[PDB]
Design a protein around this ligand. Sequence first.
Ligand SMILES: *[C@@H]1O[C@H](CO)[C@@H](O[C@@H]2O[C@H](CO)[C@@H](O[C@H]3O[C@H](CO[C@H]4O[C@H](CO)[C@@H](O)[C@H](O)[C@@H]4O)[C@@H](O)[C@H](O[C@H]4O[C@H](CO)[C@@H](O)[C@H](O)[C@@H]4O)[C@@H]3O)[C@H](O)[C@H]2NC(C)=O)[C@H](O)[C@H]1NC(C)=O
Ligand SMILES: *[C@@H]1O[C@H](CO)[C@@H](O[C@@H]2O[C@H](CO)[C@@H](O[C@H]3O[C@H](CO[C@H]4O[C@H](CO[C@H]5O[C@H](CO)[C@@H](O)[C@H](O)[C@@H]5O)[C@@H](O)[C@H](O)[C@@H]4O)[C@@H](O)[C@H](O)[C@@H]3O)[C@H](O)[C@H]2NC(C)=O)[C@H](O)[C@H]1NC(C)=O
Ligand SMILES: *[C@@H]1O[C@H](CO[C@@H]2O[C@@H](C)[C@@H](O)[C@@H](O)[C@@H]2O)[C@@H](O[C@@H]2O[C@H](CO)[C@@H](O[C@H]3O[C@H](CO[C@H]4O[C@H](CO)[C@@H](O)[C@H](O)[C@@H]4O)[C@@H](O)[C@H](O)[C@@H]3O)[C@H](O)[C@H]2NC(C)=O)[C@H](O)[C@H]1NC(C)=O
Ligand SMILES: *[C@@H]1O[C@H](CO[C@@H]2O[C@@H](C)[C@@H](O)[C@@H](O)[C@@H]2O)[C@@H](O[C@@H]2O[C@H](CO)[C@@H](O[C@H]3O[C@H](CO[C@H]4O[C@H](CO)[C@@H](O)[C@H](O)[C@@H]4O)[C@@H](O)[C@H](O)[C@@H]3O)[C@H](O)[C@H]2NC(C)=O)[C@H](O)[C@H]1NC(C)=O
Ligand SMILES: *[C@@H]1O[C@H](CO)[C@@H](O[C@@H]2O[C@H](CO)[C@@H](O[C@H]3O[C@H](CO[C@H]4O[C@H](CO)[C@@H](O)[C@H](O)[C@@H]4O)[C@@H](O)[C@H](O)[C@@H]3O)[C@H](O)[C@H]2NC(C)=O)[C@H](O)[C@H]1NC(C)=O
Ligand SMILES: *[C@@H]1O[C@H](CO)[C@@H](O)[C@H](O[C@@H]2O[C@H](CO)[C@@H](O)[C@H](O)[C@H]2NC(C)=O)[C@H]1NC(C)=O
Ligand SMILES: *[C@@H]1O[C@H](CO)[C@@H](O[C@@H]2O[C@H](CO)[C@@H](O)[C@H](O)[C@H]2NC(C)=O)[C@H](O)[C@H]1NC(C)=O
Ligand SMILES: *[C@@H]1O[C@H](CO[C@@H]2O[C@@H](C)[C@@H](O)[C@@H](O)[C@@H]2O)[C@@H](O)[C@H](O)[C@H]1NC(C)=O
Ligand SMILES: *[C@@H]1O[C@H](CO)[C@@H](O)[C@H](O)[C@H]1NC(C)=O
Ligand SMILES: *[C@@H]1O[C@H](CO)[C@@H](O)[C@H](O)[C@H]1NC(C)=O
Ligand SMILES: [Ca+2]
Ligand SMILES: [Ca+2]
Ligand SMILES: [Ca+2]
Ligand SMILES: [Ca+2]
Ligand SMILES: [Cu+2]
Ligand SMILES: [Cu+2]
Lengths: 715, 723
Amino acid sequence: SQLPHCPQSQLFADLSREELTAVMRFLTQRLGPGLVDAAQARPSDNCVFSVELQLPPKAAALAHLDRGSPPPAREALAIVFFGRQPQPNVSELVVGPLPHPSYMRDVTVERHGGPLPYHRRPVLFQEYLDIDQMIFNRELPQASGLLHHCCFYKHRGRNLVTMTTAPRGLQSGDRATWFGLYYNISGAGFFLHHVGLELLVNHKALDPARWTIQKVFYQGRYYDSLAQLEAQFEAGLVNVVLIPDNGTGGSWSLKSPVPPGPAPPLQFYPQGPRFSVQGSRVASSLWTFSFGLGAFSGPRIFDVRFQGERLVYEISLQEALAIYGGNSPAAMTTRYVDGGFGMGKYTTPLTRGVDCPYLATYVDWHFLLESQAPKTIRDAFCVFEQNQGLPLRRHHSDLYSHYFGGLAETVLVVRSMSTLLNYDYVWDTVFHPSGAIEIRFYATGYISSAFLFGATGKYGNQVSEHTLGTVHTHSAHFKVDLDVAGLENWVWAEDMVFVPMAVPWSPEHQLQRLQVTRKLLEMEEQAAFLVGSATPRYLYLASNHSNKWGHPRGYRIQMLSFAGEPLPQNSSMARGFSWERYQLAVTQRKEEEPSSSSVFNQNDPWAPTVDFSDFINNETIAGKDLVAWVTAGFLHIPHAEDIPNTVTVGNGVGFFLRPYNFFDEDPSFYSADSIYFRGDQDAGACEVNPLACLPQAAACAPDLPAFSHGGFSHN
Amino acid sequence: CPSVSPSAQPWTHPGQSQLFADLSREELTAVMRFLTQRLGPGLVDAAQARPSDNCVFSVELQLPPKAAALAHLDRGSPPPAREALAIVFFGRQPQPNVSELVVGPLPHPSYMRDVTVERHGGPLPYHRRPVLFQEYLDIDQMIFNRELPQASGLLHHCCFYKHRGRNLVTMTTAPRGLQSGDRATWFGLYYNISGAGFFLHHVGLELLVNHKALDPARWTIQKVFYQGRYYDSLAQLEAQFEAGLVNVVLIPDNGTGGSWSLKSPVPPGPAPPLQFYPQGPRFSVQGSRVASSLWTFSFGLGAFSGPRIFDVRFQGERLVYEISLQEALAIYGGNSPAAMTTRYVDGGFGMGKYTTPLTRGVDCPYLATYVDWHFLLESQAPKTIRDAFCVFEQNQGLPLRRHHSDLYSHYFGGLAETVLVVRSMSTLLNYDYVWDTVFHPSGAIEIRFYATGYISSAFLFGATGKYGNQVSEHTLGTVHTHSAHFKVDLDVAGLENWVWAEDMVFVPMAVPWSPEHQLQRLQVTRKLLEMEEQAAFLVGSATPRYLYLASNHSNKWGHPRGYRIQMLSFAGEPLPQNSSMARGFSWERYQLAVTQRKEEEPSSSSVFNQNDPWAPTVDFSDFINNETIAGKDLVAWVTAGFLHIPHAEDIPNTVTVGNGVGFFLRPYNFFDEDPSFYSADSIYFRGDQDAGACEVNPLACLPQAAACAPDLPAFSHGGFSHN
Ligand SMILES: *[C@@H]1O[C@H](CO)[C@@H](O[C@@H]2O[C@H](CO)[C@@H](O[C@H]3O[C@H](CO[C@H]4O[C@H](CO)[C@@H](O)[C@H](O)[C@@H]4O)[C@@H](O)[C@H](O[C@H]4O[C@H](CO)[C@@H](O)[C@H](O)[C@@H]4O)[C@@H]3O)[C@H](O)[C@H]2NC(C)=O)[C@H](O)[C@H]1NC(C)=O
Ligand SMILES: *[C@@H]1O[C@H](CO)[C@@H](O[C@@H]2O[C@H](CO)[C@@H](O[C@H]3O[C@H](CO[C@H]4O[C@H](CO[C@H]5O[C@H](CO)[C@@H](O)[C@H](O)[C@@H]5O)[C@@H](O)[C@H](O)[C@@H]4O)[C@@H](O)[C@H](O)[C@@H]3O)[C@H](O)[C@H]2NC(C)=O)[C@H](O)[C@H]1NC(C)=O
Ligand SMILES: *[C@@H]1O[C@H](CO[C@@H]2O[C@@H](C)[C@@H](O)[C@@H](O)[C@@H]2O)[C@@H](O[C@@H]2O[C@H](CO)[C@@H](O[C@H]3O[C@H](CO[C@H]4O[C@H](CO)[C@@H](O)[C@H](O)[C@@H]4O)[C@@H](O)[C@H](O)[C@@H]3O)[C@H](O)[C@H]2NC(C)=O)[C@H](O)[C@H]1NC(C)=O
Ligand SMILES: *[C@@H]1O[C@H](CO[C@@H]2O[C@@H](C)[C@@H](O)[C@@H](O)[C@@H]2O)[C@@H](O[C@@H]2O[C@H](CO)[C@@H](O[C@H]3O[C@H](CO[C@H]4O[C@H](CO)[C@@H](O)[C@H](O)[C@@H]4O)[C@@H](O)[C@H](O)[C@@H]3O)[C@H](O)[C@H]2NC(C)=O)[C@H](O)[C@H]1NC(C)=O
Ligand SMILES: *[C@@H]1O[C@H](CO)[C@@H](O[C@@H]2O[C@H](CO)[C@@H](O[C@H]3O[C@H](CO[C@H]4O[C@H](CO)[C@@H](O)[C@H](O)[C@@H]4O)[C@@H](O)[C@H](O)[C@@H]3O)[C@H](O)[C@H]2NC(C)=O)[C@H](O)[C@H]1NC(C)=O
Ligand SMILES: *[C@@H]1O[C@H](CO)[C@@H](O)[C@H](O[C@@H]2O[C@H](CO)[C@@H](O)[C@H](O)[C@H]2NC(C)=O)[C@H]1NC(C)=O
Ligand SMILES: *[C@@H]1O[C@H](CO)[C@@H](O[C@@H]2O[C@H](CO)[C@@H](O)[C@H](O)[C@H]2NC(C)=O)[C@H](O)[C@H]1NC(C)=O
Ligand SMILES: *[C@@H]1O[C@H](CO[C@@H]2O[C@@H](C)[C@@H](O)[C@@H](O)[C@@H]2O)[C@@H](O)[C@H](O)[C@H]1NC(C)=O
Ligand SMILES: *[C@@H]1O[C@H](CO)[C@@H](O)[C@H](O)[C@H]1NC(C)=O
Ligand SMILES: *[C@@H]1O[C@H](CO)[C@@H](O)[C@H](O)[C@H]1NC(C)=O
Ligand SMILES: [Ca+2]
Ligand SMILES: [Ca+2]
Ligand SMILES: [Ca+2]
Ligand SMILES: [Ca+2]
Ligand SMILES: [Cu+2]
Ligand SMILES: [Cu+2]
């Protein structure tokens, strides 16, 4: 013996390197020279900010996928900043038959009913650099006496770093950004090392020369300017607290002081993998779908088919939201609308063996954002099968007949991860062998901290020396366009109630008769459930047709959410993310309603570009193309166990999509992996029980490839 | 490659005793010998016993008092007396009762004490006794010999009644009557399907058997339900049948599909994923102790209460003295008498007593560690459930923590989550409960149960879905609720604990640097829960999103060291209080409750509540009164459950997907930092370093170390029995 080694269209695929190049060429040509690389651009420059796939209309996409009609025009969307103009109108531009582009159309006025104001533009990478020039050259030296005393200020400024805040002002049009100052920690999170200084930078002016500092916050007190502070410091009435710059422990490191022990468990596929990834399609025994990333909206999946039948046209991440409170101006006013940064744009490489199982299939992402040449995130997606170590179904019979019949649960996962400043979002889409789909998101990585000062926990817990863990809420929104056995769908709500009754065979007694309550949700407003409201324990979208037993074929939404209290309606800001107020909502699917948020809401939520609440508009949902909008989130009070990073344990939040009288029986009855044997049969007979042959088939060493990491440069 | 353990399991310090281990084969025998001797002959084997017999029903471990167990485990004092509890049916008596008997220093027993009056303040009425196995058989003798032939004219037309032999089977129901003292049991009749679930094949006939009488001869049938109508007797029916005015619907005798089979018609494809430990396992099971790098605990099964875990220590420090399953509950509704009155208090049967063997590769990962359970229940010799427990490490394929830094400094730091699982499975008639306890490397503990197996069905007749969905031909999937109760005795950094509730609120404010504007100031609300009543959260009430039990002392950062209860529950509407029955499972009405831990309050339920819930033996709500929970030995009672409306996807069995329900126990300012920073398995590397250098990144050496065929043993299965 010498034991051996172990072994449909691309219509939703993200744009390829060539396709991105072809649109940029087309753009530089037909948009008139005078065009700046977005990495270099200034406010008054003309700029291509983003180029990514423009999703096709549903009717044409379906006509192709089902009826066999020709494909709709594959198109791209480009976001262009028009700065070299007296009145800038930032513009949305559709481009070309995209294999060989040939036209261009401005849809800004079409979609948003008017020009997009220039102040809504996301803060460019160059703009961030210009801001640091002002802070470190023009501004911080004015307080170098203070900074020398507190913060180890070196005459060449880079022992400090800045981190952005959130809605840039108090009012539509504003562009004033608080910036915290942190020690530039090497090889670990700086987010835990706030030096106690925040600066309110006004960078609305098209000329960076005219940018000013409106306010200064230092270790618990406000000031008018860095001079106004520095004066009071040298006057002896600004008492510093030394924030150390270096130490040992989790506050300072991610490297463990403990050497590796015996290896942890490892999965492998003893008879080869049981799925394939061809570009943007994944195909398996049971499942079929196309996947991808929106540059700003994030992970998304299309044309999902269980055993050949479409369940859902589109499941896409729509927006993520982090609302903070604190004792300092940065924390108590931060409301991150992360789509304004980009969940796809900030997708980080997946570390083989940590982020996914070692033997997962890792896939690269190509993008064109804030530059002129397209780039790649290596290992942006991972796709893998996971043995849950759990049975999908089971029965063990000792009664009247001796038999066992079960099936271990093995799932198919698709995963992306977005690192947005301090934290890391994980985006799970899990496909179950019962026909159910699962959407779970996780929040890990570093917390956001502030300098600790006279406060009684109204704003968080002390996690380390001089460091306040600022309270905040996470919440995300998902577009779920179910097409349950066709387009036309209805929304059902079923639930329970007890009814007192005389016992039929003894009316002198009283029982409580358990019954099912069922209601058809006719209007959009009946399917809009606010956060905090009582919710039907069974809510499902169903077809007009029936299964074998006469029940409408539906799937059901089941939510795992600990949703936090939403930002009040009184706040002018709330309209920019009014989807937070809901747990779940079903609206008519409409081409002119493709998303619940916009990349332009982050910088101007008071005059929102997209306001989700407008979609809920008093229509019928009885027999239309429906789409479910699910909000999942939770409240996070940071604590000491949250200082290496946030652990994922218990913080996974999301929802299930489960068949409810959609089939005539559970399809895992037909499973090729279901185990069954009688008590009079031989359970060790490989003939009878495939598990008995597992030692023979799994008697091989894996061929697990050499460790690669997708790298990261300095973008 | 390795075959057993690698580098000698763990090296920690001492303090490993099996004071909580279930009784061994020897220990059970010694008590039975002791009982037959000193309890006076006239004693019958429980498997053979009749109502009027004298009977040993159960013998199992009697848990020690906390104070003596702790003094031994910590202070070093001698162990408390290892004892056992025996349930004895006293039938050969003018006034028959059931009695609870403690017995002996249990290595070599020497005494006996009746604690029935001590614990329950009086004798245990005999009608509360669980229905014996022999009692079920006697009922079937009555039904099949004395009773069913009286309607064989009907039965030959509808149901393939063969001569006298059984092709039909009965299934019990739940609270046996309408009133304290009753013992009248509905029995459904089903085709005795071979090799698959009979529960999906209700023939449409239910019989109300009165078996309260100590003499089986005096047992009678009070009522008969057939295909939508009631009758007085099987003769009264059989009359109207031959009279031509009882219209039968043929229920078929046989078929194909999930309605009829569990065997797939599809042959095996390529093997599914498999885990293994490339450098040996990283944990050990010595009897009832489990020990790993991080975790240490003793596990077991109560015969009626079910799975339980004791003396849990993360990195050598106790977090919890006891986490035990307490009771499981299934409340049904239906169009027939059986369904619409069924309220199973499964502890009255036994979650441990009905623990089934774990099939290697389906119920747990193939390479899990399977452990046997010894018991003495309804017999005179102890038996064994082979592979009753499984213990294993599971790579979650999920990171525990992660950061990928592209900003100001190029680094990655993370750790893939690997968990430690302990699992039992209880098959109670139609359904299969899975009992998970998952130990996380963050210091968190997780309790998840699952419900799978066959649904209970009834014969379908004129009904508009008020009681369920039609799942197959002539089969109604009856609506019901699952719910279970957990005793969680946390001792957070000592016995004395307080209960904290933290939650959130927004406060309008003028903007400090622009008072012309308004902000909404996010703040934290915090309240100390002082009285037991403040910590009793009813189902449907609003719950603090942060609720935790904490010590008097503080972590490095001055915060009280606590753990936190986080619940994943979709709990169903509870049985109303207006019902006289509800007192037998009043724990259902709460989501979570914290009470003073007391020796005389060891359990929220009783095996004797199933047959007499109107006069409950244990009434949970009595635990909640006007006592302080500010600085005592506390104990949390967590309820988790959901509503189940059966549907077509539930006809091979119930899938576990999404039906997992339970709660988390997570550290909240208990440590000075997340202990997984110190993980031996944490990955970290800078951008200027070599990620492929094994020196730098242990993952790079994984292909070298995982170049190994496993040594996965030959498949065993734990067999079955005729009980
Ligand atoms: C916060 O503090 C940190 C230290 O405490 C600072 O970290 C330092 O950042 C600099 C700037 O990024 C790093 O640059 C130096 O090292 C790199 C490494 O080069 C190697 O790896 C590259 C992959 O990124 C390859 O592309 C290279 O070919 C090489 O294999 C050098 O690339 C740097 O550039 C040098 O050479 C170029 C070209 O000739 C010159 O233009 C530069 O002037 C320079 O001479 C640097 O040598 C540095 O590694 C890093 N230090 C540590 C210890 O990690 C950090 O800069 C600071 N804050 C900010 C805002 O950056
Ligand atoms: C928001 O702002 C954007 C730009 O910031 C606006 O887009 C501009 O729209 C203007 C009209 O609203 C348009 O202005 C005039 O010019 C175009 C013609 O220019 C286009 O076509 C030429 C081709 O024509 C000949 O001449 C050119 C030299 O100009 C030669 O190179 C060429 O070879 C050919 O012989 C293109 O070359 C050129 O690049 C333009 O695409 C007219 O059609 C208009 O009617 C109008 O008179 C201006 O060109 C647009 N800017 C562009 C395309 O960069 C947008 O309108 C605005 N929207 C709102 C609501 O304010
Ligand atoms: C289930 O829903 C589908 C989809 O339609 C949607 O749901 C229904 C319930 C409504 O809410 C609609 O508003 C939604 O769009 C239904 O599909 C339709 O089914 C029809 C019957 O099978 C079919 O037409 C048939 O009859 C045609 C004759 O027209 C009749 O009506 C006119 C008056 O309008 C009457 O004068 C005339 O005498 C006829 O009786 C005939 O031409 C067709 O060949 C066919 O036989 C529709 O074509 C079809 N819809 C489409 C778009 O094709 C389905 O009926 C629903 N089933 C139910 C409710 O059981
Ligand atoms: C944290 O809590 C523990 C547990 O006690 C519980 O919580 C405290 C806060 C109270 O609410 C108790 O009612 C709860 O049961 C505390 O443990 C206790 O700590 C004491 C201080 O070390 C210790 O007693 C010490 O002092 C004794 C002298 O008695 C003094 O008080 C009387 C007035 O009553 C006075 O006349 C006398 O002159 C003394 O000044 C001494 O005899 C002891 O030997 C010992 O040195 C208690 O024994 C102990 N509790 C128990 C049950 O043993 C702990 O202090 C708290 N820590 C904090 C608040 O930081
Ligand atoms: C409901 O129907 C069930 C089947 O339809 C009945 O199950 C049967 O129950 C009997 C009694 O418990 C059980 O024992 C019988 O078969 C044994 C095994 O068969 C022998 O022969 C085979 C070869 O054919 C050989 O491989 C075996 O090793 C074994 O030697 C006999 O050993 C035994 O003596 C007895 O005859 C049956 O196995 C079982 N049949 C099935 C198909 O499960 C059940 O009894 C009935 N319910 C009630 C309440 O009656
Ligand atoms: C939100 O807007 C509602 C509008 O009806 C307003 O009532 C709330 O303002 C005030 O809240 C106070 C409690 O925090 C209350 O004492 C006061 O009466 C109430 N104002 C009025 C006119 O009744 C607004 N709440 C918030 C949080 O902004
Ligand atoms: C942060 O501080 C540690 C010590 O706390 C530094 O370790 C020092 O390293 C230098 C050179 O590498 C030695 O000369 C010192 O003797 C070390 N000190 C101790 C106490 O071990 C570490 O270098 C510091 N971090 C950085 C980035 O310089
Ligand atoms: C169940 O029946 C299967 C096929 O028999 C079918 O049923 C009878 C009533 C007739 O309608 C006949 O024409 C059909 O073919 C068998 O293959 C199977 O063995 C039967 N199951 C048993 C006997 O347990
Ligand atoms: C219980 O009885 C009271 C009688 O006062 C009644 O008001 C209440 O509605 C009843 N509850 C239920 C669930 O029937
Ligand atoms: C004490 O218990 C009674 C019920 O007997 C209750 O009404 C009262 O509110 C309780 N008081 C306190 C302080 O717990
Ligand atoms: Ca709408
Ligand atoms: Ca739809
Ligand atoms: Ca109490
Ligand atoms: Ca306690
Ligand atoms: Cu968070
Ligand atoms: Cu159920």
